[PDB]
């Protein structure tokens, strides 16, 4: 049954916002799993934070089809190498959603101004286009090398670029550009299925007719093919971070032929194998939401090395991975360490080895592990050193092919070598970040303490007992900001005094406040490695339960743009809250976890363009759905335990390595049955409120008996 | 006799200006012939156009010793990797010229604030330092990665950089920076002869004590070695355009040992072999001026490829030359095609093969040959496509190892593929550049017509007869701007009308005027490939002679900063005039050439800091002296003829390939004997006013009979 699973993915979920609500910043264009190429229309001349992927569902004009982007980020970048079909040298066109389709590996739209049909597909490193022009009209392609994310942010400018016509069917070039990533070099090689008859190249006002090459900072091409009289024009475009030669080789290996439908079909088969890793059973809407979410987790991290292994490293030099390896980038770690990376350990252990290796390369050539990585380099966005949980998690779980001593070097040195937002001599001297020395101090203290717990766990695994003590002590530094009267984590200055005045509802931004894109209410819960300690500090399990109740019911509104989708003070759009609904289990009240998780799944996710309660954040919003719908969530994303919530779907099957399955099953009378009555794992009654990574990866079956009313299970 | 020739070089010639006069923009620090490293003190925090090499003789403060620069340019760039010795973390110091020495491959200065002695030398790709601290004082080195040319020009900013301490004796890093060259990557590897005891790294206000690495845009290091108590600190620094690994390898191969005096001695031996290629006899002052000029021609073009052959190409990718090859850059072509490159065909034919190959690489990866090349890429400074005369000249003269068909491809395509300041479809449609379509139109028309003559000559050599006609016709386009009433070359618009009003004294700049850094009086003479045509147009030899007389005696003053050193309207500081004193030969009055050449040599060159009548322009001012002092000059620098002037020196011997000499000899009673009475070449009386390249390269002897009064020779 071809398209059995892929037919459920709706790439328009998360591409817009309804009224003035919240968008995922997802894109509907074609891509391949963990690919280099995201071939998609831009509905803006210059993508910005409100439409960072390049597309907005509320818009009606397409300004070209570019080949790279981020999914669900709060800042725009990439947007490289932009083609537009036309008959009269035009650069934009109207379109309607009524004449537009999208599915895994495929996008189509009718461009209405000149009645030209556009279809897109991809391979791992190539974009394939097919354009159908009216019979009797001239066929032309415009290449725009200036089109990019907004040039008024990040000091973004094109340093240099080239367009070069090699023969009548081939064009190469490149651009070097600054932005959110400090410096990116994007090389291309392009071919046409019909010969170029005439052409024009320009750089701003400087125009050159039928000229084989141009160099500059504001380049544009127009290639004219004449009357095609019903033959569609097929275009192929390969990219590289290193060279035009590599891009050409990427095309020779992955995309040598000219059969468009064959490319489309392979892309669909590829997505069917990927999405097939979790087979689910539920309503038609739930399958659409679930498979679309699973898709969003699998469109990055992005392939960066070429088919010959070469890539631009973090010291801006050209290097090569081994034959069986792939260098990846796009690591939105402040979001993705929480759920996306745990999800990859279940579904993509072979890729996780390459992700870890890619992170370690930043250490090897830049001096510390990635904080937030984009086009092979760090941009320091957000806080923490959250490569560390990801590398730790992979090693403790036994993901194969990782050099452990080298990984520990990287992790250790990243934790003792001070760098922006990590003053480690301040850290160990005070036992916290003082707000007057390091801003975002309370968020950093909580998140960094968690990173240190991870280092400790890795030290213990390698019998490095002195290191263990050092990092274990550091992991307990959250205590130094716990205020004993108010029972919030609050900021202190270097004299050890509590900053006055303090309001736990007050949102901070990305500096000038002790919290990062949230308030003290939301950050209170961030001790994922020692919830028992946190419970004790709050005044015991009963006290901790009541504080959670206040958190989930208190509707006061002070503000920050990123935090949205509210259940009291709980904002599902920002990921400090994401683990919190699972904390009622720890308090002795699992039914409350089941209640709130079910509320969020049913109420804050949907199958319209709005889709999500905030930016998808490289699929972290989606990974939350994937996990929670299956019925468990990695509260501590480095301890290899998944905390039970409430399974949404009737059944899920995880297709694992190799010949193995983890089968999740439900006994229910209706969808109102959201409370767990009991759980069985491999025939034995299951008394804990978690399952382990080993429980899943061994293969087996887990059965949930559900009911309409709270049971008493784990109570 | 060690230092027989090197003792004559005075690196302070051209480093200053006296009253408000004119400087060469030369530098006194250490370098090697055609090297990668120019290790020299900067007397400014941020070098600008008034001190573009980094040093000014009128200054009394040193702000560090950097490792790269240009010699004699009108804009600053490079200035990379800056060390400063100190005992108390200081960044600047007073010095006096009384306690400062310099000679080929060596610089020394006493830094007076803390009484520290600095000595510098180089290899091809390494800089070697030796610092002597007072006994009883702490030894420290500051590394400054922000120090550069003025950041308010060219949009210059550091994109990213690194300092990284590898062990107690080794530091690596890099910087990526924009400027006059669009994008440069400079990687380094450094070692110390004593172990680092403590250290600090910072990025702006962010300071990290005893921390092994830092990344950012404004980086500074301080390394502390303790009390050395009389042991000098030796530092070694290698560079690369590609990687830290390559830089380290450059040090392993060229500079593995720790004997400073041995490095100094090899640098001096290397310079003695180079300067020894012309052995001269004259007064002590003339030998100082001559050998210093010869030195200035040999400090660039600069080595860019590492010892493994790797280099950054003009498409910003990493490539590799063959084993026996070297990739070079720093091609100040608008100046250097005139005399410097002709000089290299006599003295450096083996290097010229590599220069030509390096130029062709820009064509291969960027689409046309270099106009003005800097750190492996074009910056378009000035006008013309003046790689073309250089490549043409080398091929016609039979410089070996140049692929001629590939070279012709590069030359041809660079002459028909339009690009900035070369609208070739405008060129062939109008038979000139119309000022209202292309500015600097008269200068471009004259200089481009000369480039086209060169292409024609190359076409004829390869029996490409259609091409010959095309480019020969183009070479005659100077005629289309010759005004028949006024007898100047003047600007026209696209309707073919002469622009009114027109003043032949009025200087233009680099746009908005039809002349480039000069007036119509100075550009009038630029038809070096058809002086007979120019003579006819002026009204015959008598008329042409009289126009030259007016040019050399008319003292009116309107203005431009670059044009200076005046003999009437003749300005020796700018190179459009440079061939003009030799034109009296063509008019039938060689004594007048001999008079004016002798005046310029004796009056506009000197052995003080001012030194030259304008910027040295990568040794073009110096190459003029070298040629003219020997007694001939390449008026047409692609026809292989050297036009006779007046020999200044008693004797010169050119030491050629191999076992061959060209011996130039004079019969004279005193230095007042400046007029040529007769000339002998290989025993036969020499009736022409030129000698050929073959006459010189075959070896032989040329004798000038001189006298106090004009003779009648060639009259
Ligand atoms: Ca978010
Ligand atoms: Ca000049």
Author numbering:
A (entry chain A), B (entry chain A): 19 to 576, 579 to 735
Per the authors:
Structural analyses of two glycoside hydrolase family 92 α-mannosidases, BT3130 and BT3965, together with mechanistically relevant complexes at 1.8–2.5 Å resolution reveal conservation of the global enzyme fold and core catalytic apparatus despite different linkage specificities. Complementary to α-mannosidases within largely eukaryotic mannosidase families (particularly GH38 and GH47) that play important roles in N-glycan processing, GH92 enzymes are metal-dependent, featuring a single Ca2+ ion coordinated within the catalytic active site. GH92 enzymes act via a classic single-displacement mechanism, leading to inverted configuration at the anomeric centre.
Indeed, quantitative structural comparison using the DALI server shows that the three-dimensional structures of BT3130 and BT3965 have high similarity, with an r.m.s.d. of 1.4 Å mapped over 738 matched Cα positions (sequence identity = 40%, Z-score = 48.7). Interestingly, however, while Ca2+ derived from the bacterial expression host was consistently observed within previous structures of BT3990, both BT3130 and BT3965 showed a somewhat reduced ability to bind and sequester this required divalent cation. Therefore, to ensure observation of the true, catalytically competent forms of these enzymes, and the determination of meaningful ligand complexes, BT3130 was screened for crystallization with the addition of 10 mM calcium acetate (final concentation) to the protein buffer (in addition to avoiding K+-containing screen hits), while the subsequent ManI complexes of both enzymes were cryoprotected with the addition of 1 mM Ca2+ (final concentration) to the cryoprotectant solutions. Within BT3130, the 580-loop is positioned lower, and projects into the +1 subsite at a steeper angle, leaving a larger solvent-exposed space at the outer surface of the substrate-binding cavity. Furthermore, the hydrophobic ‘roof’ of this subsite is contributed by Trp67 (rather than Trp88 as in BT3990) and appears shifted some 2.5 Å towards the outer surface.
